[PDB]
Each structure stands twice: as C-alpha cells, then as structure tokens.
C-alpha cells in the first residue's frame, strides 16, 4: 500500500515570558515516531516509537542540530510576520507547517506537502504541481515573491522526490512490522430509557486501530440516514480508539434494528443487535 512521512511544526511566540516555543513532530503513516521540543535545558530529537531506537547517536545528533537551526530561523520569521501584518510586539502568535511526502506502493511520490499557517489560518502552500505557490493574503504574497526569486519550489521538489522518499523507505524498514498493526473493534449494544414509549440503542466499538471506522444502524436491513447520533472517534489512551452511534426507536421494536461495524482489522463487517440479558 501507500505510505507517508509528514512533519508537523509549531512555533509559538510568548513576549516577555521567554524565547518562542518550537516543536517538530514526525509522523509515519499518521503515527508519531519522532519529536523535538525546544522547551528544555538541552532539547534533543527523541524517538516516539520504540522501533526508532534502532537509529544510532549520529542520527539523533544530526536531526537535533538541524532542529535547532530550524527553531532559530522560525524565531526570525515570527518577527518578520509582525512586520508584514503591522502587529504589535506584545502578543503571542503561531506559525505552523505541515511538510512531507506520500508515496505509492511502487515507492514513487504521489503527493508532496509544504503548507504554512499563521495564527491558525492558511498562509502559503506549495501547489500540487510542486512548481507554484498559493498565497492566502497580501502578506503571503511577499513571501511568495521571495520564494519565487530564490527557486524555493524547486528546492522543495528535490527534497520531496529525494530525501523525503528515501528516509520514508528507511523508517518503513525499521518499523513496518508494527506499522501494519490492526486491532479489530470489539462491539456491543447498550439500551437506554427515553421519555414515553421510545428507547435509545447505542452501538459501541472499542479498542480498534487504526482510528478509521464506520458504524451504521439498519432497520430490517435498510440504512438510516437521519436521526443517527454519534461521537467523533476518540483515543482510549492505550493507543486504540473508540466510537459509538445511537438511534432512538420504539419500545418493543429493538429487535428490528441492527448495528453494522466496518473496520480494516475485521475479517468481515460486524453485525449486532440489542441482546436483552
């Protein structure tokens, strides 16, 4: 299948209260594997998945120094943006970056990302062509011209098609076993009182991974489009996820409803009902 290596970068200024807080967080296939956090006496790149402990001391030293170089560059950028936007020196501000590559099963680049946001809104992004930029406002136009001048888009393409793909290949080698992990949902239905002659049937899916999942309720084997309640999928805290979907149905008609659970961990989708004990 396809794979991705993505880095999520955060730079948060805090005037009066210190140097900005800088963070780099790396993801292989949407799971955190490394992290640099500048909020320390001696900040170091650290493995966040035990399979990264394979990498030797030179890896950590090299990534650490490059992180610290990045941090200092973003410290400058925060000041630059105060200028572009004519903002006061006193407020806290944020710069965020999503940088990375998605590769197909053949190991060729499928998509590359270089996206920036200032105070939580789009600032600039490299387009799908890996040649041109989309600037979100008048300030980003300045950066856009700057980067057009320096051939930044070309530099990014070289990274995306080279370095990024190559490292992803290496990390996969070191962590593929645990990266392919699935945990099937364990499902059950609960029964809850409603006013008058209605009841709530709640269909739980627990302990699954990855997070992607679908729950549906059917009446007599026919899907219910309106009136299904649910929660956003949520972490259990042990590396797995939870979700539920519920419907309100007539008292005495519970047995006419079935819950269906779709997840990549399962040999086939789950079908279940309220089981009166």
């Amino acid at each position: 299948g396809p794979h991705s290596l993505r880095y999520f970068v955060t730079a948060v200024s805090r005037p009066g209260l210190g140097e900005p807080r800088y963070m780099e967080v790396g993801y292989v296939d949407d799971t955190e594997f490394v992290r640099f956090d500048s909020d320390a006496e001696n900040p170091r790149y650290e493995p966040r998945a035990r399979w990264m402990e394979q990498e030797g001391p030179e890896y950590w030293e090299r990534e650490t120094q490059k992180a610290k170089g990045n941090e200092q560059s973003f410290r400058v950028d925060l000041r630059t943006l105060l200028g572009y936007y004519n903002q006061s020196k006193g407020g806290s501000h944020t710069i965020q970056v999503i940088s990375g590559c998605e590769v197909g099963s053949d190991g060729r680049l499928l998509r590359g990302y270089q996206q920036y946001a200032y105070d939580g809104c789009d600032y600039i992004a490299l387009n799908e062509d890996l040649k041109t930029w989309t600037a979100a406002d008048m300030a980003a136009l300045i950066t856009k011209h700057k980067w057009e001048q320096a051939g930044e888009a070309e530099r990014l393409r070289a990274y995306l098609e080279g370095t990024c793909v190559e490292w992803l290949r290496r990390y996969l080698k070191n962590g593929n076993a645990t990266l392919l992990r699935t945990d099937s949902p364990k499902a059950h239905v609960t029964h809850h009182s409603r006013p008058e002659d209605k009841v709530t049937l709640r269909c739980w899916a627990l302990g699954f991974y990855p997070a992607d999942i679908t729950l549906t309720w059917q009446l007599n084997g026919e899907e219910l489009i309106q009136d299904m309640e649910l929660v956003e999928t949520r972490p259990a805290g042990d590396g797995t996820f939870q979700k539920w979907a519920s419907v309100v149905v007539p008292l005495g008609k519970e047995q006419y409803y079935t819950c269906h659970v779709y997840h990549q961990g399962l040999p086939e989708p789950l079908t279940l009902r309220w089981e009166p004990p």
């Binding site: 780099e24 630059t80 710069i95 700057k146 990024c164």
Partner: peptide
C-alpha cells in the same frame, strides 16, 4: 528527516 526551512 525533516527539511531545513527557509525564511518567510
């Protein structure tokens, strides 16, 4: 390995 960033 993350890219080295360039100034805005």
């Amino acid at each position: 390995s993350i890219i080295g960033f360039e100034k805005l």
